[PDB]
Amino acid sequence: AVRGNMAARARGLGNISGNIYARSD
Amino acid sequence: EQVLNLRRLMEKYLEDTRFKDDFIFVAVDPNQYSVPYPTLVVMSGAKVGDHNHFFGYVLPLVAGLAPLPRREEQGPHGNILVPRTWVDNLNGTFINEVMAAMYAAIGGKSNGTARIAGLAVVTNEITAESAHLATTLLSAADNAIQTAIEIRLGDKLGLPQFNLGMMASDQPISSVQYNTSGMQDSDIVGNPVRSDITVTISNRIRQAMSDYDSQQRLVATTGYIDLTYSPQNPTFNQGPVLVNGYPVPPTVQYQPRYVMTSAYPLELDAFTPNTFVLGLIGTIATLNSGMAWAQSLISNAARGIGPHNPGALAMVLDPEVTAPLDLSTQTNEQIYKFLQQVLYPSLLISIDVPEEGEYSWLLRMIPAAEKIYTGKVEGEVREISEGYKALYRAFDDVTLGCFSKKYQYGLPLVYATGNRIPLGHYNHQDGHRHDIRDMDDLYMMNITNPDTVEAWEDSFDRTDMTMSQRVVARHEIIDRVLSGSWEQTGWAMRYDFDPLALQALIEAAADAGFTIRPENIQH
Amino acid sequence: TMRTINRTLSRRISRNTGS
Amino acid sequence: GAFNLF
C-alpha cells in the first residue's frame, strides 16, 4: 500500500477574515 | 482514611461561611457498596415548583492502591495484552451503586431526583495538611453543579448565560508566550501539562477622567505543535496540490498540527461552554496573526541539538544526510526559508478530550456532536441528533444568531481520528516531572532510528489497525524508549474541527461587533 | 458591563480572595 | 464509554 494520511491535508485552515482585527485609530 | 480527612477538611472550611447547609457529603466504601475504590460525593439541590432536583460530584480516591494488571483480548492473529488504568474500572455497575447511595442519602425516591454532574480521579495522597487541594476540589464541584443547574433550568429559573454582547463597550486584547525550558503547567491534582504555547485573552479598561489604565484577564489556553506525515502523489495523473490557491514545492510532505491541551479561567468565577467558545475564538484569531505559529519552531531551533530540534527534517529533505542539522547560527528568515520547503503553509486544529478530569463534563460535548444523523425512520427529513444540536445552539448563541445565517444547518463540525492517547508523567533530567506527551514525531526523529519513526507513524496513521493494536504498539515503543520508568494516570481521545465551520464562526463573530487586537505579535 | 460580570454570573465558592 | 457513562 501507500503510507501517510491523506485526509489530514484537506482539513488544514489556511486563512481567516480580516474584519476580526481592530482597525488602527 | 482518605475519605475521612477530605470530608473533615471540607466541613472545616465550610463551617465559617454562610453555605453550611447548602452541601451534603456522601461516603461510599467497598465494605457496604459494590465499588472498586473509596469515593466521596458532594451533593447540592435546587427547587422548582414543588419538586426538588439534586446533583452530585464523584471523587474516587486511589492513592496507595496497586496498579491495574493487563487484560488479554482477542486479535486477528491471536491474543494480546492491553494496558489498563484507573478509569477502566468505572462501568455501569459503579454508576448504579453511586446513584443508589445518593438516593439513600436524600431520603428516598419521593424526596426528589438525583443526577451525576461530573467525575474526577485523585491520584495523590490526602493528609491533614491539604486544605488548599480540598478548597480547590470544592470550588470545582460547586462550579460544575451550578453550571449543570443553569443548563437544565435556566428558562424556568431566569438564569442568563455569557454571550458576545457583554463585550460591546470595551476593547478585547490577546497575548502569546513561547516557553519550552523549565517547569510546565499543572492541573488541579498537580500533574504536569505540556504548555509549549500559551494564549491569554484579556479586556482593556481606561478611566474616563483620571486616565488610569488597567486590564482584566479572562481565560487562558495551552497547547503545542505536532507533525503529520502526508506525502503528495503526482504520479496518479492528478492536479497539483493547491493551498490557498497556491502551488507548493514538490518536496513538501509534512502537515503541521496544533493540539489543545487545557483551558481554564483566570479571573472569571464561572466557566461555561460559551466561555470555552470565546477562548477557542481568541486562540484561533491569535494563532493566525501573521504566521505566529511557526515562531514556536523558530524559537525551538535556537537551542541547538536536542529532542525538539527542527533540524531533523534535513534527513527527510536529503536521503544522504544522516545526522540532524544545527540551526543555532542561522537568522530567522533563513530558518523560515528552510521550513518552507518541507511544511505545508496551513494549520490543523485538534483537541485532546480526557475521559475523566476537572473539565471532562464540559468537554464531553465535542464527542457527542460527531454523529450528525440518527438512523430513525423519517417522514421527509432525517432526524438530527442531540449533541450536534447542542453544539450548534452554543455556537449560534455565542454569536447572537449570526452563525445560523453563515453556516448551513446539518454540515459536519467535528471529525473523529480514532486514536487513544495515554496520560502520565516521567522524571526529567533537569529535576522536574514532565508530561508524557513530550514523546512525538520530532522526538523519535531526533532520538531514535528510522524504524521506530516508521512504526510510530504507522500506528498513528494506518486504518486497518484496531484501537487495541495501536495502543499496544505505542505502549511498547514508549516502554522501550523510557526503560519502563514512567507512570500512567488516564486516557484521552483526539478530535479535530472542520476548517469551514471555523471560518464561518470567525465571520459570524466579526459580524456581531467583536474585534480583537493582538499585542505580542512580532513581524 | 464586563466589570461586574462576577456579580451577574456568580458562584458560591471563589478561588481568589485577595488581601 | 466514559462519555456516555452519565
What would your notes on this structure say?
The structure is a homotetramer. Chain A is low in regular secondary structure. Chain A is rod-shaped and about 55 Å long. The interface between A and B is medium-sized, with 19 and 45 residues. Chain B: It comes from Escherichia phage vB_EcoM_Goslar. Chain B: Keywords: Host cytoplasm. Chain B: It is found in: Host cytoplasm. Chain B: This is Chimallin. Chain B: Homotetramer. The tetrameric protomers further assemble as a square grid.
Overview in brief:
Four copies of one chain form a homotetramer. With 25 residues, chain A is mostly loops.
Task: Give Rg of chain A in angstroms.
Answer: 17 Å
Terminal residue distance of chain A? 57 Å
The greatest interface between two protein chains, and residues involved on each side, is: A-B, 19 and 45 residues
Oligomer: homotetramer
Q: Tally the beta strands of chain A.
A: 0
Which structural class should the secondary elements of chain A be placed in? little secondary structure
% residues in beta strands of chain A: under 5%
SS element count, helices of chain A: 0
The biggest beta sheet of chain A, please? none
* Large-scale geometry of chain A: rod-shaped
Helix content of chain A: under 10%
Protein name (chain C): Chimallin
Subcellular location (chain C): Host cytoplasm
Subunit structure (chain C): Homotetramer. The tetrameric protomers further assemble as a square grid.
Organism (chain C): Escherichia phage vB_EcoM_Goslar
